[PDB]
């Protein structure tokens, strides 16, 4: 399910300068662009090779939109800092996710534009793409300010045209890396903790994209309660790693299987500890 997402973060440093704006753009789980306002001469830079090609107008313009967005966020913080009568001396965070899910027919599936203040849902754009939702009274104040401006009109035109159109172009320009599926490489391990039990840990390595389901099963029955399951982590080279682990009483290792679902595999993989 192909996707482009931009992840903005504006943090106030009240007694040390203007707030810092940082933005990163992803196509699926592959980063392609950044903007850091603490960079020496701040500009939007390429972070993947399938967008390094883009001309000067492209990069000058993105930079131009980024600098103007950083000004609105500083302002947005300044305002919201007011709307909870918060001291002008604690640091505060505004976060935003904007982007596109693509469809089967190269069409729009779902557009996003959501925010959060101090790590918490503040205001979001609804599925229809012309109405908002707030979390408290303070985000009602914004909802009027955004309906007045007709923001949901100009975002709908963005994420129904530009985002889908330019996503399709990125997918085609970086086809060699963006539209391969590299399914997981797997093994299971056995570490004794005592005379009477052992951790069984199922490993998935070298996979892309990051969406993966690992589960342990005792005689068909999922062990959702007992399964320690680390967050998926990048390998550093474009691929991902994850494991799932379950403490089993020794003697019963053969009743356990590990089940694995990933885009790169057409069938579920079933895996066991063979001594």
């Amino acid at each position: 399910s192909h996707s482009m997402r931009y992840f903005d973060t504006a943090v106030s440093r009240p007694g040390r300068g203007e707030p810092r704006f940082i933005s990163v753009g992803y196509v699926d789980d592959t980063q392609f662009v950044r903007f850091d306002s603490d960079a020496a001469s701040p500009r939007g830079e390429p972070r993947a090779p399938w967008v390094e090609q883009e001309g000067p107008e492209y990069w000058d313009r993105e930079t131009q939109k980024y600098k103007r967005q950083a000004q609105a966020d500083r302002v947005s913080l300044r305002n919201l800092r007011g709307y909870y009568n918060q001291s002008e001396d604690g640091s505060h965070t505004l976060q935003r996710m904007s982007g596109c899910d693509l469809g089967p027919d190269g069409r729009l599936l779902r557009g996003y534009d959501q925010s959060a203040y101090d790590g918490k849902d503040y205001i979001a754009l609804n599925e229809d793409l012309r109405s908002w939702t707030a979390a408290d009274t303070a985000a009602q104040i914004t909802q009027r300010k955004l309906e007045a401006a007709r923001a949901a009109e100009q975002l709908r035109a963005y994420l129904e045209g530009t985002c889908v159109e330019w996503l399709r172009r990125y997918l085609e320009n970086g086809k060699e890396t963006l539209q391969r599926a590299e399914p997981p490489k797997t093994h299971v391990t056995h570490h004794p903790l005592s005379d009477h039990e052992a951790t069984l840990r199922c490993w998935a390595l070298g996979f892309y994209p990051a969406e993966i389901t690992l589960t342990w099963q005792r005689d068909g029955e999922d062990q959702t309660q007992d399964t320690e399951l680390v967050e998926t982590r990048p390998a550093g080279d474009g691929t991902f790693q994850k494991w799932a682990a379950v403490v089993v009483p020794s003697g019963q290792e053969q009743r356990y299987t590990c089940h694995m679902q990933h885009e790169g595999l057409q069938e579920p993989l079933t895996l066991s500890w063979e001594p």
């Binding site: 300010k145 963005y158 994420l159």
Partner: peptide, 9 residues
């Protein structure tokens, strides 16, 4: 390509 400019919150 990034979102277009919208009024502050």
């Amino acid at each position: 390509r990034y979102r277009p400019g919208t009024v502050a919150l």
